[PDB]
Scaffold this active site. Structure first.
Site, PDB file in Angstrom:
ATOM      1  N   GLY A   7       0.832  -1.198   0.000  1.00 42.27           N
ATOM      2  CA  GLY A   7       0.000   0.000   0.000  1.00 42.27           C
ATOM      3  C   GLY A   7       0.858   1.235   0.000  1.00 42.27           C
ATOM      4  O   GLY A   7       0.710   2.102   0.862  1.00 42.27           O
ATOM      5  N   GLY A  10       0.024   5.277  -0.109  1.00 41.33           N
ATOM      6  CA  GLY A  10      -0.630   5.847   1.060  1.00 41.33           C
ATOM      7  C   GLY A  10       0.083   7.059   1.609  1.00 41.33           C
ATOM      8  O   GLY A  10       1.315   7.157   1.529  1.00 41.33           O
ATOM      9  N   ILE A  12       0.834   7.887   4.578  1.00 35.33           N
ATOM     10  CA  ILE A  12       1.861   7.480   5.511  1.00 35.33           C
ATOM     11  C   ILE A  12       2.950   6.702   4.800  1.00 35.33           C
ATOM     12  O   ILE A  12       4.134   6.980   4.994  1.00 35.33           O
ATOM     13  CB  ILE A  12       1.268   6.612   6.635  1.00 35.33           C
ATOM     14  CG1 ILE A  12       0.302   7.449   7.479  1.00 35.33           C
ATOM     15  CG2 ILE A  12       2.363   6.041   7.528  1.00 35.33           C
ATOM     16  CD1 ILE A  12      -0.714   6.634   8.245  1.00 35.33           C
ATOM     17  N   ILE A  57      -6.208  -6.533  -2.026  1.00 31.53           N
ATOM     18  CA  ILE A  57      -5.549  -7.354  -1.013  1.00 31.53           C
ATOM     19  C   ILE A  57      -6.477  -8.420  -0.446  1.00 31.53           C
ATOM     20  O   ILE A  57      -6.021  -9.447   0.036  1.00 31.53           O
ATOM     21  CB  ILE A  57      -4.982  -6.496   0.137  1.00 31.53           C
ATOM     22  CG1 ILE A  57      -6.116  -5.800   0.908  1.00 31.53           C
ATOM     23  CG2 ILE A  57      -3.935  -5.536  -0.426  1.00 31.53           C
ATOM     24  CD1 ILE A  57      -5.684  -4.688   1.832  1.00 31.53           C
ATOM     25  N   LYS A 168      -9.483  -2.652  12.203  1.00 31.86           N
ATOM     26  CA  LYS A 168      -8.087  -2.580  12.656  1.00 31.86           C
ATOM     27  C   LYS A 168      -7.826  -3.568  13.771  1.00 31.86           C
ATOM     28  O   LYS A 168      -6.757  -4.192  13.823  1.00 31.86           O
ATOM     29  CB  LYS A 168      -7.738  -1.168  13.137  1.00 31.86           C
ATOM     30  CG  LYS A 168      -7.733  -0.106  12.039  1.00 31.86           C
ATOM     31  CD  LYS A 168      -6.981  -0.527  10.775  1.00 31.86           C
ATOM     32  CE  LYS A 168      -5.528  -0.875  11.057  1.00 31.86           C
ATOM     33  NZ  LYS A 168      -4.807  -1.289   9.825  1.00 31.86           N
TER      34      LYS A 168
HETATM   35  N1  LIG Z   1      -4.564   8.220   8.620  1.00 27.44           N
HETATM   36  C1  LIG Z   1      -4.393   7.956   9.912  1.00 27.44           C
HETATM   37  O1  LIG Z   1      -4.473   8.849  10.739  1.00 27.44           O
HETATM   38  C2  LIG Z   1      -4.107   6.566  10.394  1.00 27.44           C
HETATM   39  C3  LIG Z   1      -4.178   6.325  11.754  1.00 27.44           C
HETATM   40  C4  LIG Z   1      -3.915   5.053  12.238  1.00 27.44           C
HETATM   41  C5  LIG Z   1      -3.591   4.041  11.355  1.00 27.44           C
HETATM   42  N2  LIG Z   1      -3.532   4.283  10.037  1.00 27.44           N
HETATM   43  C6  LIG Z   1      -3.170   3.156   9.159  1.00 27.44           C
HETATM   44  O2  LIG Z   1      -2.123   3.538   8.268  1.00 27.44           O
HETATM   45  C7  LIG Z   1      -2.213   2.844   7.018  1.00 27.44           C
HETATM   46  C8  LIG Z   1      -2.249   3.842   5.860  1.00 27.44           C
HETATM   47  O3  LIG Z   1      -3.341   4.744   6.046  1.00 27.44           O
HETATM   48  P1  LIG Z   1      -3.355   6.227   5.425  1.00 27.44           P
HETATM   49  O4  LIG Z   1      -3.800   7.171   6.513  1.00 27.44           O
HETATM   50  O5  LIG Z   1      -2.037   6.432   4.714  1.00 27.44           O
HETATM   51  O6  LIG Z   1      -4.558   6.200   4.334  1.00 27.44           O
HETATM   52  P2  LIG Z   1      -4.399   5.953   2.743  1.00 27.44           P
HETATM   53  O7  LIG Z   1      -3.775   7.165   2.096  1.00 27.44           O
HETATM   54  O8  LIG Z   1      -5.727   5.464   2.215  1.00 27.44           O
HETATM   55  O9  LIG Z   1      -3.384   4.710   2.677  1.00 27.44           O
HETATM   56  C9  LIG Z   1      -3.829   3.378   2.433  1.00 27.44           C
HETATM   57  C10 LIG Z   1      -3.248   2.891   1.119  1.00 27.44           C
HETATM   58  O10 LIG Z   1      -3.598   1.510   0.987  1.00 27.44           O
HETATM   59  C11 LIG Z   1      -4.344   1.350  -0.221  1.00 27.44           C
HETATM   60  N3  LIG Z   1      -5.441   0.377  -0.056  1.00 27.44           N
HETATM   61  C12 LIG Z   1      -6.536   0.496   0.719  1.00 27.44           C
HETATM   62  N4  LIG Z   1      -7.312  -0.609   0.601  1.00 27.44           N
HETATM   63  C13 LIG Z   1      -6.708  -1.449  -0.258  1.00 27.44           C
HETATM   64  C14 LIG Z   1      -6.985  -2.787  -0.826  1.00 27.44           C
HETATM   65  N5  LIG Z   1      -8.101  -3.460  -0.478  1.00 27.44           N
HETATM   66  N6  LIG Z   1      -6.090  -3.303  -1.701  1.00 27.44           N
HETATM   67  C15 LIG Z   1      -4.964  -2.633  -2.061  1.00 27.44           C
HETATM   68  N7  LIG Z   1      -4.639  -1.413  -1.581  1.00 27.44           N
HETATM   69  C16 LIG Z   1      -5.467  -0.789  -0.694  1.00 27.44           C
HETATM   70  C17 LIG Z   1      -4.885   2.720  -0.581  1.00 27.44           C
HETATM   71  O11 LIG Z   1      -5.119   2.851  -1.980  1.00 27.44           O
HETATM   72  P3  LIG Z   1      -6.518   3.479  -2.482  1.00 27.44           P
HETATM   73  O12 LIG Z   1      -6.511   4.898  -1.939  1.00 27.44           O
HETATM   74  O13 LIG Z   1      -6.349   3.377  -3.990  1.00 27.44           O
HETATM   75  O14 LIG Z   1      -7.583   2.602  -1.853  1.00 27.44           O
HETATM   76  C18 LIG Z   1      -3.804   3.642  -0.091  1.00 27.44           C
HETATM   77  O15 LIG Z   1      -2.849   3.837  -1.146  1.00 27.44           O
HETATM   78  C19 LIG Z   1      -3.458   1.992   7.151  1.00 27.44           C
HETATM   79  O16 LIG Z   1      -3.040   0.678   7.533  1.00 27.44           O
HETATM   80  C20 LIG Z   1      -4.273   2.644   8.250  1.00 27.44           C
HETATM   81  O17 LIG Z   1      -5.148   1.719   8.905  1.00 27.44           O
HETATM   82  C21 LIG Z   1      -3.773   5.512   9.544  1.00 27.44           C
END
Ligand SMILES: NC(=O)c1ccc[n+]([C@@H]2O[C@H](COP(=O)([O-])OP(=O)(O)OC[C@H]3O[C@@H](n4cnc5c(N)ncnc54)[C@H](OP(=O)(O)O)[C@@H]3O)[C@@H](O)[C@H]2O)c1
Length: 342
Positions: A7, A10, A12, A57, A168
């Site tokens: 991923g 994203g 992050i 995924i 999560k």
């Molecule tokens: N944002 C926060 O504050 C936060 C807080 C705690 C934990 N997290 C964790 O950090 C990680 C990244 O989150 P983020 O905030 O960076 O959001 P994000 O920008 O949506 O990052 C997630 C990435 O994973 C991809 N993705 C999502 N579902 C998918 C699937 N079924 N198959 C393949 N790729 C997929 C997304 O692509 P698409 O956009 O094309 O779906 C995106 O590129 C996640 O594990 C999330 O649970 C984030």
């Protein structure tokens, strides 16, 4: 000595890649489409960055191809692919199933084609898998690295918030479940990371779009909001700077001392108003173009909701986290500057 990060487009994960490269690592990101496997490589413009297409995924055996191909060469894995959608309509399909099945696929893939090779896994669990969602405003609750979200399958789909937190949570349980059952058969050592509301600037200036990723959109929306919009000044949740998160993930596979750990990343209680005050404080010349400044916030009263005992985390990581004022400022500056307002 290669690093697989799932991923990789994203918010992050793009900082994580930045850091991985800074330290001269060979990185293999995974991305949904070729469309995106192109966009990224041009941005990073680095000969150590390669990409593999994993469109979904949740799908059967979703990561097995990566490990047939790059099997011998991947020593460390950073599973950061999980859906983040605050408007999701199909809760099981849109959140829970991919969170879980995506993680089982990643792990079962490492079992099948690289049991002995993969040394370390770093998973991006969440503050969500530790907090109790409905008790965030309860200061008698203390959260530490052994605390779990008690959500069950039966009451998890109460609403979208309880759903994405459950997602999560259950994904994490599967990870650990896996580790315990197969500790004899696979070498890798799991480390889970638990960020709260991640704020901070987009790794690339060009990625400042009209609508950002879910959590930074909170700030983006507020910054462009009309002047007299209602801004919630009650305590909301915890935050942590994206840059701190990135660093932490990489440390996750490096430092011996972070094996089998759940690392809790919070660094401040905040409200919506507390964010808006940073607009008015740091860019005084733009007063009127976003909501106004008000100090009477739960934060300044001393109200922070539930307590965060992440002292074991902070000690283990060693570095100092980024102050709220800095994180919000940097997020904001990037946007306004991309827009040419400053
Ligand atoms: N944002 C926060 O504050 C936060 C807080 C705690 C934990 N997290 C964790 O950090 C990680 C990244 O989150 P983020 O905030 O960076 O959001 P994000 O920008 O949506 O990052 C997630 C990435 O994973 C991809 N993705 C999502 N579902 C998918 C699937 N079924 N198959 C393949 N790729 C997929 C997304 O692509 P698409 O956009 O094309 O779906 C995106 O590129 C996640 O594990 C999330 O649970 C984030």
């Amino acid at each position: 000595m290669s690093v697989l990060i799932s991923g990789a487009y994203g918010y992050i994960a793009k900082h994580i890649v930045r850091v991985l490269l800074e330290q001269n690592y060979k990185v293999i990101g995974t991305v949904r489409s070729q469309d995106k496997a192109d966009k990224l490589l041009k941005q990073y413009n680095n000969p150590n960055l390669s990409y593999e297409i994993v469109p979904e995924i949740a799908n059967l055996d979703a990561f097995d191809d990566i490990f047939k191909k790059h099997g011998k060469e991947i020593k460390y894995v950073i599973h950061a692919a999980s859906p983040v959608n605050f408007g999701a309509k199909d809760l099981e399909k849109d959140l829970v199933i991919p969170a879980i099945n995506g993680t089982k696929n990643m792990f079962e893939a490492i079992k099948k084609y690289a049991p002995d090779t993969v040394e370390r896994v770093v998973m991006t669990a969440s503050y969500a898998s530790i907090m109790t969602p409905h008790r965030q405003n309860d200061p008698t609750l203390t959260l530490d690295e052994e605390t779990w979200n008690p959500v069950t399958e039966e009451n998890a789909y109460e609403n979208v918030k309880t759903a994405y937190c459950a997602s999560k949570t259950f994904a994490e349980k599967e990870a650990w479940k896996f580790v315990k059952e197969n500790s004899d058969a696979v070498k890798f050592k799991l480390t889970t990371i638990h960020p709260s509301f991640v704020f901070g600037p987009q790794n690339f200036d060009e990625d400042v779009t009209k609508k950002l990723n879910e959590t930074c959109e909170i700030i983006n929306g507020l910054l462009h909001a009309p002047f007299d919009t209602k801004v919630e000044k009650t305590h909301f949740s915890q935050f942590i700077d994206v840059r701190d998160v990135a660093k932490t993930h990489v440390l996750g596979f490096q430092k011996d001392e972070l094996i089998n750990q759940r690392l809790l990343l919070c660094n401040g209680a905040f409200s919506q108003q507390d964010i808006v005050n940073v607009f008015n404080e740091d860019f005084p010349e733009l007063k009127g173009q976003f909501p106004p400044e008000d100090k009477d916030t739960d934060l300044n009263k001393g109200v922070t909701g539930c307590k965060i005992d992440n002292e074991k985390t902070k000690k283990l990581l060693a570095f100092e986290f980024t102050p709220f004022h800095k994180t919000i400022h940097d997020t904001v500056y990037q946007i306004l500057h991309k827009e040419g307002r400053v």
